[PDB]
């Protein structure tokens, strides 16, 4: 049921998505070990992901959460990186997309920083890097990230120096608590709480 519609670079939707990708790059504490060394991306393509069934699954859950939270879904647009992005766009998120060893328990993780999600495109800690060159900092191979609509509802705030949500909450927020420049990370424990809205194909760029 999934179709991918290419956005034109002249389209304001393309432009606002590219800006969120570019403007949320930061330096990482591993100096680029996991995701590579770069300050920006070369964006090759942005596709809209269209799946009626998966959309209806998202909006149904969004309505449940909202009615549990004074009519407030607390919906965000967040990045997700994974070796399985091509399964996600066809089948949606579910328990097999969870990060079992994540710092906030076995759930599905999303980032405000695009460069954080970039660290997981080739697997946990960047795995062994690109499949062609075995290079975590490959500047040639094409990478893909998702930019997703995510329902957080009432989020449990964890100050930070599938399982269940903490009782009375619909998600967990990982608040950066040492690195003053890092943006938040978020965890959901139900795959129906995210819809993978854009597929972004890119390369990381070598600093000049
Ligand atoms: C911890 C964290 C913070 C912020 C963003 C992300 C993210 O985008 N992906 C991931 C991530 C981690 C692992 C996996 C895939 N594992 C591979 C076997 C199934 C789960 C997929 C995505 C983690 C993450
Ligand atoms: Zn490569």
**What is the dihedral angle through the alpha carbons of 3, 8, 14, 18, rounded to the nearest 10 degrees?**
110
- Note whether 69 and 153 are within 8 A (CB): yes
- Note whether 186 and 117 are within 8 A (CB): no
- The HSE-up count of residue 181 (CA atoms within 13 Å, CB side) is 9
For residue 146 the two structure tokens come to 């998702």
The method recorded for this entry reads: X-ray
First to last CA, the chain: 42
Separation of alpha carbons 68 and 137, rounded Å: 43
Q: For residue 80, what are the domain limits?
A: 1-208
Q: What is the resolution of this structure in A?
A: 2.0
Which ranges of 24-51 does DSSP label H, i.e. alpha helix? none
Q: What is the count of structural domains for the chain? A: 1
Task: Identify which of 86, 122, 41 has the alpha carbon closest to the alpha carbon of residue 199.
Answer: 86
Angle at alpha carbon of residue 55, lines to 51 and 57, rounded to 5°: 120
Q: According to the annotation, is 130 in a ligand binding site?
A: yes
Distance 78 CA to ligand 2 centre (A): 26
For residue 95 the two structure tokens come to 């328990």
The DSSP bridge partners found for residue 158 are 174
Distance 59 CA to ligand 1 centre (A): 23
Task: Give the CATH number of the domain where residue 155 resides.
Answer: 3.90.228.10
Task: Identify which of 82, 104, 103, 45 has the alpha carbon closest to the alpha carbon of residue 196.
Answer: 82
Cβ(99) to ligand 1 under 6 A? yes
Separation of alpha carbons 182 and 3, rounded Å: 34
């Amino acid at each position: 049921g999934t179709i991918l519609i290419d956005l034109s670079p002249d389209d304001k939707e393309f432009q606002s998505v590219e800006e969120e990708m570019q403007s949320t790059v930061r330096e990482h504490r591993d100096g680029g070990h996991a995701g590579g060394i770069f300050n920006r991306y070369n964006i090759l393509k942005i596709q809209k992901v269209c799946n009626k069934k998966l959309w209806e699954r998202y909006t149904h859950r969004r309505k449940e959460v909202s009615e549990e939270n004074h009519n407030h879904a607390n919906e965000r647009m967040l990045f997700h990186g994974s070796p399985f992005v091509n399964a996600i766009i066809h089948k949606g998120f579910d328990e097999r997309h969870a990060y079992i060893g994540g710092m906030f328990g076995a759930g599905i993780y999303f980032a405000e920083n695009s460069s954080k999600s970039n660290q997981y495109v080739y697997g946990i800690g960047g795995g062994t890097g690109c499949p062609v060159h075995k290079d975590r900092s490959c500047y040639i191979c094409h990478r893909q990230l998702l930019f997703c609509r995510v329902t957080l509802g009432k989020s449990f705030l964890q100050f930070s120096a599938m399982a269940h949500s903490p009782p009375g909450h619909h998600s967990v927020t990982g608040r950066p608590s040492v690195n003053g420049l890092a943006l938040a990370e978020y965890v959901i424990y139900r795959g129906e709480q995210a819809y993978p809205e854009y597929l972004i194909t890119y390369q990381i760029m070598r600093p000049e």
